[PDB]
């Protein structure tokens, strides 16, 4: 019933590990379909070969800008941006997958994986999934980031797709 997608992560081309995500399509369906479809690449464009452009140790890893590769771009499967579906789920801990945005109703394709409890984000970013397998791969990724987000090595989504 709820889809599961994976990401095979790479640090400058060396394979690092697989993170897999359960998308809560039963509560945030339109948000979950957009991450699912961008992971499969079935609509022609997507996450494969994009990188995490902003990694802040102890906060979150952000990625998903496949058009401009630096947080200023990305687009959804419904157009460039769409509404905040709802705020049922909250940022309760590491592994929560939440939507990045540029204020309300500006969701595109950027997402962030929390590596800590970030309750201040509640009510401001739609949560739509959580890490299933691979959280120590997300944790190891932190080491390649910095206080301001700049990463030291290129961290890419080498491959991604749907598992179930």
């Amino acid at each position: 019933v709820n889809p599961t997608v994976f990401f095979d992560i790479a640090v400058d081309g060396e394979p690092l590990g697989r993170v897999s995500f359960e998308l809560f399509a039963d509560k945030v369906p339109k948000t979950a379909e957009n991450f699912r479809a961008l992971s499969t690449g079935e609509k022609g464009f997507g996450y494969k070969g994009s990188c995490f452009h902003r990694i802040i140790p102890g906060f979150m890893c952000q990625g998903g800008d496949f058009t401009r590769h630096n947080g200023t771009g990305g687009k959804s499967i419904y157009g460039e941006k769409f509404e905040d579906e709802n705020f049922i789920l909250k940022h309760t801990g590491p592994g929560i997958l939440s939507m990045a945005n540029a204020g309300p109703n500006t969701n595109g394709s950027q997402f962030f994986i929390c590596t800590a409890k970030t309750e201040w984000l509640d009510g401001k970013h739609v949560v739509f999934g959580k890490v299933k397998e691979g959280m120590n791969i997300v944790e190891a990724m932190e080491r390649f980031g910095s206080r301001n987000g700049k990463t030291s090595k290129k961290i890419t989504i080498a491959d991604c797709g749907q598992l179930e």
Partner: protein, 220 residues
């Protein structure tokens, strides 16, 4: 157009002459009215960009509308190329190079490459993108063919209410400015331009009146 097999896989299939004949006949007989976009979307489901270029080049006459559609497709392809720059260098063995706007249009690419794009893993929907572009162009064309504006509608003293509302909703579907603006128009302009007798018969029912009672009031 691609078609699935018994085991589930799909492979290219030659375009049926019946589809082309029906498309040309409906274009000739029904000209450019709001009911060509649904039939176009139904006729060419899963059609390759070559098949869509066929269905467009085959339309004899109304060359101005086809030129408008070509210009719209050109602008959409330019915007697609601007929003999705293609990478240079060697391409991976398990991946085929991503198409450009002029190649999404299918103008400078072979049919085998379109089939490889459409049956790749994951599949790339070039046909659906070019169909969306053609549908937008056809929407602009049916906007251009619109004979009269929405505001100039005024019922004659003898023209029945049925013909009035028919003409109104015809040019309203041909307008396609928006949805909520259309909803406001069908509330205000529909009752604002009635013949005085039937006009006050409709005002007797108030703004809460629906279309059915609106018509059976002036009926008989």
């Amino acid at each position: 157009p691609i078609v699935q097999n018994i085991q589930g896989q799909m492979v290219h299939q030659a375009i049926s002459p019946r589809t082309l004949n029906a498309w040309v006949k409906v274009v000739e007989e029904k000209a450019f009215s709001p009911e060509v976009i649904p039939m176009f979307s139904a006729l060419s489901e899963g059609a390759t960009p070559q098949d869509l270029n066929t269905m467009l080049n085959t339309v004899g006459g109304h060359q101005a509308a086809m030129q408008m559609l070509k210009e719209t497709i050109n602008e959409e392809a330019a915007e697609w190329d601007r929003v999705h720059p293609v990478h240079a260098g060697p391409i991976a063995p398990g991946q085929m190079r991503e198409p450009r706007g002029s190649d999404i249009a299918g103008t400078t690419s072979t049919l085998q490459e379109q089939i490889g794009w459409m049956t790749n893993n994951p599949p790339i929907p070039v046909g659906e993108i070019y169909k969306r572009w053609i549908i937008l162009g056809l929407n602009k064309i049916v906007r251009m063919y619109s004979p009269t504006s929405i505001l100039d509608i005024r019922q004659g003293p003898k023209e029945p209410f049925r013909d009035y509302v028919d003409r109104f909703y015809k040019t309203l579907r041909a307008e396609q400015a928006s949805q909520e603006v259309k909803n406001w128009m069908t509330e205000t302009l529909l009752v604002q331009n009635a013949n005085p007798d039937c006009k006050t018969i409709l005002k007797a029912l108030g703004p809460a009146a629906t279309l059915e009672e609106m018509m059976t009031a002036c009926q008989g």
